[PDB]
Design a protein around this ligand. Structure first.
Ligand SMILES: CN(C)c1ccc2nc3ccc(N(C)C)cc3[s+]c2c1
Ligand SMILES: CN(C)c1ccc2nc3ccc(N(C)C)cc3[s+]c2c1
Ligand SMILES: [Cl-]
Lengths: 172, 175
């Protein structure tokens, strides 16, 4: 809708096809059809451009979670929503951006709010078996999310659904 | 002087990806990082493809050796699974993860990982119809989540928290 969002969506597609390393005002101008000046008006620095990409993807996840959560005041329903959203294979651009986020605290902070609001807390995991049982579900969901990239046998739709169901049954 | 020069070059290339990226790894940048001439690099790796293959093979071999070293009674699938979980509790490095993501770009790279995966990682044959296979794969998925944690989440999971979760995942293995 907004021009800023269109620029970001274009940049996200670009890094999957090419790379984060070659994403520049020049390559994004070609990809968007906008002039470099036009791009700079919306993203004053390359750091700001990358930050905007992280922020947009984090917001997309937050919106999907809010859309499917049955009871937002129930942590187990919020956990179910997280598991369901993670059941689909992570997209290539999203995975490459997540791997790049630790390069700067500003990028990690763009992801921090959605993580802080939806991922089960890690405080006292060492001494709280309940918190470990809940976090175990999160870890399995994360494994399903990245599966096709770290295993050499993509999951068929039926096997993926079977594992989603197996993880949902693991919720306390 | 503890390894071959060929292995040193590969370790330097892997570290180069860690400081920069896989995208900019080239004979030129590797020449600078190793202090060797392009001619010297070509002697060991005749093409960039050969260089990438060598990195996949080295990393796959490192994992296989770690698993062989810590697995007692390896003919028992459950002992292999317990050892695999322990090896995956330490977070993957960024260069290794970038290489795993890139492996499908050529069958040679996939093939480099095939032997180790086939010997140690459960297959998903008939997963939809085998409850025991799903129970084992659930453990594999949780271990994988621990392995990639710091690169799909914003927070680094501490050693003590990883230790606690490692124990929790091992408890999940059918016994
Ligand atoms: C684990 N992490 C950090 C992330 C980050 C962003 C994400 N975005 C999504 C966007 C849409 C969607 N749908 C099912 C529509 C699912 C997801 S899952 C997801 C997981
Ligand atoms: C899941 N995948 C694809 C992989 C690939 C390579 C790996 N390499 C290692 C090397 C050493 C080590 N140690 C604990 C010493 C642990 C690991 S875990 C690991 C997992
Ligand atoms: Cl069964």
């Amino acid at each position: 809708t907004s021009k800023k969002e269109m620029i970001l969506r274009t940049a996200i597609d670009y890094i999957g096809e090419y790379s984060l390393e070659t994403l520049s005002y020049d390559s994004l101008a070609e990809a968007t059809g906008l002039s470099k000046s036009g791009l700079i008006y919306h993203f004053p620095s390359r750091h700001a451009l990358l930050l905007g990409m992280h922020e947009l993807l984090a917001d997309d996840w937050d919106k999907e979670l809010r859309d499917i959560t049955r009871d937002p005041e129930d942590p187990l329903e919020r956990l179910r929503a997280v598991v369901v959203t993670l059941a689909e294979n992570v997209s290539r651009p999203e995975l490459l951006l997540l791997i790049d986020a630790p390069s700067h605290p500003d990028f990690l902070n763009a992801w921090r709010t959605v993580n802080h609001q939806w991922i089960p807390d890690t405080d006292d995991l060492e001494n709280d078996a309940h918190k470990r049982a809940v976090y175990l579900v999160q870890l399995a969901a994360d494994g399903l999310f990245v599966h096709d990239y770290i295993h050499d046998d993509v999951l068929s739709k039926s096997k993926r659904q079977a594992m989603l169901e197996t993880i949902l049954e693991l919720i306390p």
